[PDB]
Design an enzyme around this catalytic site. Structure first.
Site, PDB file in Angstrom:
ATOM      1  N   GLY A  26      64.312  59.440  74.270  1.00  0.00           N
ATOM      2  CA  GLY A  26      65.060  59.363  75.656  1.00  0.00           C
ATOM      3  C   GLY A  26      63.904  59.590  76.707  1.00  0.00           C
ATOM      4  O   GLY A  26      63.898  58.311  77.313  1.00  0.00           O
ATOM      5  N   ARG A  76      60.746  60.946  59.527  1.00  0.00           N
ATOM      6  CA  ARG A  76      61.646  61.939  58.745  1.00  0.00           C
ATOM      7  C   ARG A  76      62.898  62.102  59.130  1.00  0.00           C
ATOM      8  O   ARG A  76      64.024  62.133  58.236  1.00  0.00           O
ATOM      9  CB  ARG A  76      60.904  63.407  58.617  1.00  0.00           C
ATOM     10  CG  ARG A  76      59.576  63.696  58.216  1.00  0.00           C
ATOM     11  CD  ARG A  76      59.219  65.412  58.371  1.00  0.00           C
ATOM     12  NE  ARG A  76      58.174  65.578  57.439  1.00  0.00           N
ATOM     13  CZ  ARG A  76      57.523  66.647  57.240  1.00  0.00           C
ATOM     14  NH1 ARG A  76      58.121  67.895  57.875  1.00  0.00           N
ATOM     15  NH2 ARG A  76      56.537  66.926  56.472  1.00  0.00           N
ATOM     16  N   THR A 122      31.690  50.491  58.288  1.00  0.00           N
ATOM     17  CA  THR A 122      32.769  50.816  57.305  1.00  0.00           C
ATOM     18  C   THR A 122      34.047  50.824  58.067  1.00  0.00           C
ATOM     19  O   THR A 122      34.916  50.182  57.509  1.00  0.00           O
ATOM     20  CB  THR A 122      32.572  52.440  56.944  1.00  0.00           C
ATOM     21  OG1 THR A 122      31.470  52.644  56.365  1.00  0.00           O
ATOM     22  CG2 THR A 122      33.723  53.074  56.157  1.00  0.00           C
ATOM     23  N   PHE A 140      46.370  54.227  59.639  1.00  0.00           N
ATOM     24  CA  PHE A 140      45.314  54.709  58.799  1.00  0.00           C
ATOM     25  C   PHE A 140      44.343  55.758  59.693  1.00  0.00           C
ATOM     26  O   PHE A 140      43.499  56.425  59.247  1.00  0.00           O
ATOM     27  CB  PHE A 140      44.405  53.743  58.413  1.00  0.00           C
ATOM     28  CG  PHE A 140      45.023  52.607  57.225  1.00  0.00           C
ATOM     29  CD1 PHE A 140      44.336  51.629  56.913  1.00  0.00           C
ATOM     30  CD2 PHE A 140      46.332  53.021  56.926  1.00  0.00           C
ATOM     31  CE1 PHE A 140      44.958  51.107  55.866  1.00  0.00           C
ATOM     32  CE2 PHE A 140      46.908  52.470  55.951  1.00  0.00           C
ATOM     33  CZ  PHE A 140      46.322  51.060  55.521  1.00  0.00           C
ATOM     34  N   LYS A 141      44.465  55.597  61.180  1.00  0.00           N
ATOM     35  CA  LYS A 141      43.713  56.376  61.883  1.00  0.00           C
ATOM     36  C   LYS A 141      42.263  56.538  61.628  1.00  0.00           C
ATOM     37  O   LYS A 141      41.489  57.297  61.208  1.00  0.00           O
ATOM     38  CB  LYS A 141      44.179  57.884  61.900  1.00  0.00           C
ATOM     39  CG  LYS A 141      45.515  58.301  62.370  1.00  0.00           C
ATOM     40  CD  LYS A 141      45.920  59.500  62.323  1.00  0.00           C
ATOM     41  CE  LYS A 141      47.635  59.657  62.583  1.00  0.00           C
ATOM     42  NZ  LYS A 141      48.453  58.975  61.491  1.00  0.00           N
ATOM     43  N   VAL A 142      41.643  55.155  61.476  1.00  0.00           N
ATOM     44  CA  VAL A 142      40.299  55.025  61.045  1.00  0.00           C
ATOM     45  C   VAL A 142      39.397  55.745  62.035  1.00  0.00           C
ATOM     46  O   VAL A 142      39.315  55.733  63.199  1.00  0.00           O
ATOM     47  CB  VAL A 142      39.995  53.322  61.355  1.00  0.00           C
ATOM     48  CG1 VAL A 142      38.641  53.130  60.676  1.00  0.00           C
ATOM     49  CG2 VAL A 142      41.083  52.550  60.440  1.00  0.00           C
TER      50      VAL A 142
END
Lengths: 209, 209
Positions: free
Chosen positions: A177, A190, A75, A67-69
């Site tokens: 690597g 991806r 909050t 989430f990268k709060v």
């Protein structure tokens, strides 16, 4: 190190697909190659936080909420509590908002027996503007606060080496690597879930290790 | 200006309660004093994104998603699309991650006819570590990219004046008395939803305007 999490095959799947069916399907195809999955807001906001518990039950995997709060302390506390209540084993938090915002997360993780990962730096082009210059200080702040888990970029090996130098050999470090020469585990997205065949894609990556 | 949103009574309710019942109840009690509500992750993660459409339908209000988006471009795009698809009229985005991360949001808002608010600075204590020092540059980045809506701190009025100076009188600025001398609207939360009677609390604030 016995006190840090063990990520099977040192490979973390970044399941960025936004469709529940697709996310579960693709993850199922590569379930034999990983035991740790990173889920972010795209999937959770589109399908609901209940998807976290669904992944843990269907695959018996560890879930890291990417989430990268980056909010104010109170909050951040609420976001962490909601996320851990939903079953997340760990959560990724930004360090740029300062020490109190990071500590708010640490408090909840301590209380609930979960883990906090401090994001020290990002690799997208825009990261050069403000993030790159604050990276070392953010990493040091994490170390000074007892943070044991970190997320660092892979694009520049020498930068990952610098991060490892700051956090020490004891800290747990994951990178999106040679990367594994400094990071404990790599995060792949991806390259796996978008490939014609995710299984072969994941199998190939591991073989290289 | 006619090209900027009009916030009734220049008062935005920060609905930070995490319980759907309470959030809807308290909001209902003060519905006559506001037409714009800011909803964040605490409520959305706990109750689901469908809560955004529920607020718009039950109160006919504008919804600003105070998510403080701070991810890579691709992910920011996905977060914005999911949030706008859920009905949000606007979304608040961090500028610390750089220009490409902000543009990713602007692209989706343009496509879907919604708005992006650039968060230039925060007021919690920890904000002085990295955020305060990058605030002016972030605001200037917003101006250079055509961003029309901004979120700035309210604790120090001279800082709000500085921000207003950078973004110009044409830009729309919201901040969490003298504050409205520079900001177009103020964001109030706890003082309202936690008060013995939010209605009287909201009414009092407005009377001072």
């Amino acid at each position: 190190r016995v006190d840090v999490m063990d990520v099977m095959n040192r490979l973390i799947l970044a399941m960025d697909l936004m469709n529940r069916d697709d996310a579960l399907r693709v993850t199922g195809e590569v379930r034999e190659y990983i035991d740790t999955v990173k889920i972010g807001y795209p999937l959770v906001l589109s399908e609901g936080m209940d998807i976290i518990a669904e992944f843990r039950k269907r695959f018996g995997c560890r879930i890291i909420a990417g989430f990268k709060v980056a909010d104010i302390p109170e909050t951040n506390e609420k976001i962490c509590r909601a996320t851990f209540k939903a079953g997340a084993d760990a959560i990724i938090v930004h360090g740029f908002p300062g020490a109190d915002s990071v500590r708010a997360c640490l408090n909840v993780a301590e209380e609930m027996g979960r883990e906090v990962f401090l994001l020290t730096e990002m690799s997208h082009p825009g990261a050069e503007m403000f993030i790159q210059g604050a990276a070392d200080e953010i990493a040091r702040m994490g170390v000074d606060l007892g943070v044991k888990n970190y997320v660092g970029p892979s694009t520049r090996p020498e930068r990952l080496s610098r991060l490892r130098e700051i956090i020490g050999q004891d800290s747990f470090l994951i990178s999106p690597g040679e990367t594994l020469r400094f990071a404990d585990a790599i995060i792949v997205g991806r390259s796996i879930y978008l490939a014609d065949n995710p299984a072969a894609a994941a199998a190939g990556i591991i073989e290289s290790i």
